[PDB]
């Protein structure tokens, strides 16, 4: 089984903060390559483009202010883009455009920057517990085993992160051990505690 290579392709690209992202272009021979252009559109910014004309041996960058976002090496050898260390500002669209004799081909990446939340769990008052997921990105989801009578804060910071707190009470004395269940893309997490 092998279907034809589609012209436009789009993908969600979740990436952790402070890591080295690398976006690949589709596989292409130099013979088939005329131009190759990374268009990088971050939220509320001018469009940065990085072109490489093979015939004329020209590399041309336009409106590219962030110097972490670069070629992996050189577009005459390697058409991969990298992000030096990922930051929350790098949320945006990244598109490899490839001019060939056959046509034009696009592989796009909807890049999402993940931030691992600081997760805690503590006994608060008489038969209550509080589970925090502090300054993660995106918002984490919190649930309890067993279920109680809980309430949830969402706190949306300007740097893009979100704190999700969940206070929860158990009046019923059928409960002693309580388990917080924090659900996040960076990684799911669980925390048991005796409710002394």
């Amino acid at each position, epitope marked *: 089984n092998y279907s034809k290579v589609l012209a436009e392709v789009n993908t969600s690209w979740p990436v952790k903060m402070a890591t080295n992202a690398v976006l690949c272009c589709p596989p*292409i021979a130099l013979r088939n390559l005329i131009i190759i252009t990374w268009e990088i559109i971050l939220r509320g910014q001018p469009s940065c483009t990085k072109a490489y004309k093979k015939e004329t041996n020209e590399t041309k960058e336009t409106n590219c202010t962030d110097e972490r976002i670069t070629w992996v090496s050189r577009p005459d050898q390697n058409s991969d883009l990298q992000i030096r260390t990922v930051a929350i500002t790098h949320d945006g669209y990244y598109r490899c455009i490839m001019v060939t004799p056959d046509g034009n081909f696009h592989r796009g990446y909807h890049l999402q920057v993940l931030v691992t939340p600081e997760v805690t769990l503590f006994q608060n008052r008489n038969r209550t517990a509080v589970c925090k997921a502090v300054a993660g990105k995106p918002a984490a989801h919190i649930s309890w085993i067993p279920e109680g009578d809980c309430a949830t804060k969402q706190e949306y910071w300007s740097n893009g992160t979100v704190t999700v707190k969940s206070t929860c009470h158990w009046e019923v004395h059928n409960v002693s051990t309580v388990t917080c269940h924090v659900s996040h893309l960076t990684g799911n997490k669980s925390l048991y505690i005796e409710l002394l």
Partner: antibody, heavy 118, light 112 residues
Framework: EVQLQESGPGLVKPSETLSLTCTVSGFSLTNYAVSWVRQPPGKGLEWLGVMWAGGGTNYNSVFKSRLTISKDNSKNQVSLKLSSVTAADTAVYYC????????????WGQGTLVTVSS | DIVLTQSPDSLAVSLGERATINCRASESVDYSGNSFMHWFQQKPGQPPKLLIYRASNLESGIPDRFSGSGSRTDFTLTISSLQAEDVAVYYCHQSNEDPPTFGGGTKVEIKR
């Protein structure tokens, strides 16, 4: 299924033009490029030229003076025309579909022997 | 014009034994860390059959005894256990630079 088929005279007199026509089914010529390779008796493979999907062409430099490749998308046909032929041009002529970007030649025609002789 | 050079030009091997065919290129055939060397099988009367595309990738409907390896300028086709039908000529093929070029050919024969 993807198929290719070469038509041709089989015998050609020296210093005349060799005309062949690859006829294709299973795919459109608007999407896929097509190449011509030849194979002289008991010798290796030699690329002649490509008819890119877009309509442009490249030719092997040693054949570039004599060789012409054209196509007709509505007929699903690719022509080859090699002028000023000699005994050296005696060979089996294959047409073969290139897949885009990589230039891998996945499907081939059965071939057609062309003998240059008076 | 990249010059592909297969080695050996023919080998004889007993039935069931391994069979390795090398192909070295005069220049690199790589771009973006992808090697554009491809392997063909041709039997008398028939056109070339694609075994292996971009260096290591196995084609649909080809036995898994056929395998491919290498990068840059040095590549290898390996038949893990040679069968009676595998007697053929084998060709390497670069597609990275214009013009595409083919290897000289390697004839494989069974000893019995």
């Amino acid at each position: 299924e993807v198929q290719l088929q070469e038509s041709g005279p089989g015998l050609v007199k020296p210093s005349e033009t060799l005309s062949l026509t690859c006829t294709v089914s299973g795919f459109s010529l608007t999407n896929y490029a097509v190449s011509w390779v030849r194979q002289p008796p008991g010798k290796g493979l030699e690329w002649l030229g490509v008819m890119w999907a877009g309509g442009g062409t490249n030719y092997n430099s040693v054949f570039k003076s004599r060789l012409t490749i054209s196509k007709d998308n509505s007929k699903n046909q690719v022509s080859l025309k090699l002028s000023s032929v000699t005994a050296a041009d005696t060979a089996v002529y294959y047409c073969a579909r290139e897949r885009p970007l990589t230039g891998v030649m996945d499907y081939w025609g059965q071939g057609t022997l062309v003998t240059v002789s008076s | 014009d990249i010059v592909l050079t297969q080695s050996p030009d023919s080998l004889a091997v007993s039935l069931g034994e391994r069979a390795t065919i090398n192909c070295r290129a005069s220049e690199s055939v790589d771009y973006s860390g992808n090697s554009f060397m491809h392997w063909f099988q041709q039997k008398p009367g028939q056109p070339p059959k694609l075994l292996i595309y971009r260096a290591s990738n196995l084609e649909s409907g080809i036995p898994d005894r056929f395998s491919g390896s290498g990068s840059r300028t040095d590549f290898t086709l390996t038949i893990s256990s040679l069968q009676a039908e595998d007697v053929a000529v084998y060709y390497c093929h670069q597609s990275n630079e214009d013009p595409p070029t083919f290897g000289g050919g390697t004839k494989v024969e069974i000893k019995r």
